[PDB]
Structures are given as structure tokens and as C-alpha cells.
């Protein structure tokens, strides 16, 4: 299990002087989502290419890449266009095996959202997969938060830090939700956190979101 975030280690939105729209968009309406596809190509050792039009999926390692080539898979996640290379669009992880992983209805996972330690609200996200990627769930989660709680706005964010914690049975892991300090967000660097292709079992996952205000 990933241990919790140390003090300071969480990124701060007031130490980001670039444009929060650079992050908001990764969790806006547009995203990649394809059902029952197989890879037609491979740029580097750690990636696979799909036509969905061209999407290059990059894993953290070869074993993953090799694992899902020549497999029919579902593909879901957040993509980017800038500093993206096939030598068309790029993403990390977000792959799951299609056959044997499908539910005929949607599971609901409750997301619990806290602010300065208080209970802010709860809402559900939906998934028709037995096993689903944390990336998918994160994006369903943040998306709702962007439409409804102004989590990311064009210029800045009303929250100071924020992380998203996933607990299944008794293991847990977390993502920082704020861009690293400086005057310019890099989408490709941020999104790399999802290249381990982490999977959770939908029947069992709990999700909690922890935001502070400034």
C-alpha cells in the first residue's frame, strides 16, 4: 500500500501561476473511450497504437505493452494533443481486457468528498466493468466535481490542495489533484501517473476525495 501524503508534498494551487484551464480540460467532456478494440501498431517498446482517430497508449513498462497487444480490450482515459508523438492523440494506461469483464448493468461507486475535514458532499459514479481502471474512476469523479463544485476553473481553483484516495479491501493508493508548482502545466507529465494501468475491482472499491481551501 502507498503511504499517505507527507506535509507539503501535496501540490498547491496558489503555487501554480499558469492557467488552471490547462488541467480542467483533462477532466472536461472530451476524453478517449473505445470498446472492444485491438492494437494495430507500436511506436516504442512501452506503447500500443489504436484506431478509434489515432490513439497512442503508453504503459510504464514493456510487460504491460506486450500483455495487451493481440488482445481485444476496452480503452478509457484522459488524452492530450500537445507534445504528442507517433514518430492523432496520446494517453497513459486506461486499458482493460474486454472479454469476460463486462456487466450488463452499471455498478455505482459512491464518492465521498470532504472539505477542510468536513463533509462536503457525496455522489455516485457508474461503470459497466467488473474490473475498471482507477484512471476511469478518477476521471468520472473529477468530471462531476468540475461540472458541479467548481473544482477546476478557467483561471484558478478555489481549492488549495486535493487528493483522491482509493481503498479496495485493505490496500489503498492516492493521486494528487493539483498541478506541480510553476507558471506552466504540462499535461503529458501529469497524466504519466496513470501508466502503471492500476485496476480496481468495482464491486469493492471505495473512493474518498480530500480538499482543503486557502
Amino acid at each position, epitope marked *: 500500500s502507498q503511504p499517505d501524503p507527507k506535509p507539503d508534498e501535496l501540490h498547491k494551487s496558489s503555487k501554480f501561476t499558469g492557467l488552471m484551464e490547462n488541467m480542467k480540460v483533462l477532466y472536461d*467532456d472530451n476524453h478517449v*473511450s473505445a470498446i472492444n478494440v485491438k492494437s494495430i501498431d507500436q511506436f516504442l517498446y512501452f506503447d500500443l497504437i489504436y484506431s478509434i482517430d489515432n490513439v497512442r497508449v503508453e504503459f510504464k513498462n514493456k510487460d504491460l505493452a506486450d500483455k495487451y497487444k493481440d488482445k481485444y480490450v476496452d480503452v478509457f482515459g484522459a488524452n492530450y494533443y500537445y507534445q504528442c508523438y507517433f514518430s492523432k492523440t496520446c494517453m497513459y494506461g486506461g486499458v482493460t481486457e474486454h472479454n*469476460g469483464n*463486462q*456487466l*450488463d*448493468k*452499471y*455498478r*455505482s461507486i459512491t464518492v465521498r468528498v470532504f472539505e477542510d475535514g468536513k463533509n462536503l458532499l457525496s455522489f*455516485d459514479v*457508474q461503470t*459497466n466493468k*467488473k474490473k475498471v481502471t482507477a484512471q476511469e474512476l478518477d476521471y468520472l469523479t473529477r468530471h462531476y466535481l468540475v461540472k458541479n463544485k467548481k473544482l477546476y476553473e478557467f483561471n484558478n481553483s478555489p481549492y488549495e490542495t486535493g487528493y483522491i484516495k482509493f481503498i479496495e479491501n485493505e490496500n489503498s493508493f492516492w493521486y494528487d489533484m493539483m498541478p506541480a508548482p510553476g507558471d506552466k502545466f504540462d499535461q503529458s507529465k501529469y497524466l504519466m501517473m496513470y501508466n502503471d494501468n492500476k485496476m480496481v475491482d468495482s*464491486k469493492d472499491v471505495k473512493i474518498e476525495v480530500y480538499l482543503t481551501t486557502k
Partner: antibody
Amino acid sequence: VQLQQSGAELVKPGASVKLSCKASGYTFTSHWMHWVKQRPGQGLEWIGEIDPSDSYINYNQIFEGKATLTVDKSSTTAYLQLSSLTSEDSAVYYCARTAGLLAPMDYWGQGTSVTVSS
Amino acid sequence: DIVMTQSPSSLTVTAGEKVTMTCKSSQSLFNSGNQKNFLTWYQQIPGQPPKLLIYWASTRDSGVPDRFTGSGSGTDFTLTISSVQAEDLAVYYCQNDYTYPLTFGVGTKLELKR
């Protein structure tokens, strides 16, 4: 597609009953099997769901200490086992199949009527 | 659980007039990624199983006649029967077909007038 059920089964109060649902037409492991309960004149209640190929089950929490779903791959039969019955379990129990994935329950059994009394 | 509120629970009308049933969900049945409202309408004839009429709020099941039509989205839904008939006496049930647990409404009784 047919869903072969039985008309009714009499059961003593405290006893444990196992209902069955034989299918023909489509290959079993291609579809999910749902059960629904209905008391006399009353509305409909959803018990659960099973995926024949891997026996992945989704129950309604309401029925988890009461209902068990299983399958038989050799003779393509869908079972629901109720246990430890009371008057309130008296009702008709339907099996039904799903049309594929994110699709409604299209074909249904005639329904087994269940009576709980001594 | 999602709560389906259905109404009215009883409806007498003469054979030939239009009829309006409503189903009100407590949570929304709309999805975006592949966007259909996941609500199913069922027709039950006494002493027989529920028979599918409509899926995805508006789509008619193969066979089912075009007189039946389903409209609305999100949390409000309509079952309309253009000119009712004698074969139509039933309890009409709406169902949350979106998320576990699947749930049903109380049902609306369609009683013919004569």
C-alpha cells in the same frame, strides 16, 4: 428462446427450497440470468443476477442472507436457492434473461409459485 | 437503491382515447458516454410474466405495436398509449434499468371503460 420453470412448489416454514430454470435456443454463457420476486397482487422486486461463464453474481443486499444463485454448465440450468423460509417469502419467483449488455430482460419464465406453510 | 415513483396507480378510460402514465426517478438514469436514458417499461397481464414494451426510454421492442410510445429523460418519463384497446388491460410497470439494484415502480392499473 424458452425459459422452462415449474408451476409451484409447496414448502414448510423453516425449510430451504431450490428453484430451477432450464433454457434453450441461445448458448447459455452468452447472457445474464436475473431473478425477480412478486407477492400476490403486489409489485415486483429484483433479487439478483448471475453470469454463467464465470458465475459472477450481483445480489440485492435485501436478499443476500436469503438468496443463493448458481448455475449448471453441463445442462445449462439456472438455479436460485432460497433458505430458511417464512410467510413473507411466499410469492412467485421468475427467472428471466437479459437481451445482451445494457439491454432489458426480454424473455421470462412462466414463474414458480411459492407457498410457505405447515 | 433508486426509487421509481409511478402514477396514477389506477386509470379508467374508454377504448379509443390517449392515456398518459408517468414514472419519476429519484436519481438520474441518464448516461453520457453512450447516452440513452436507461429506463424500461413493462406490461403485465394478470397471471403471467412481465412483458417488455420499451427499453432506453423510447425504443420499442420488436413486435410491440407502434401505438405505444415513451418520452422524456433524466428523472421524468412518459408512457403514452395512442388510442387504448381491449388487449391493453394490464398493470404497466416502469423499471430502473441503469444501476444495481434494478428497481421497479408500484405500477399503474389500466382499466378499460365501456
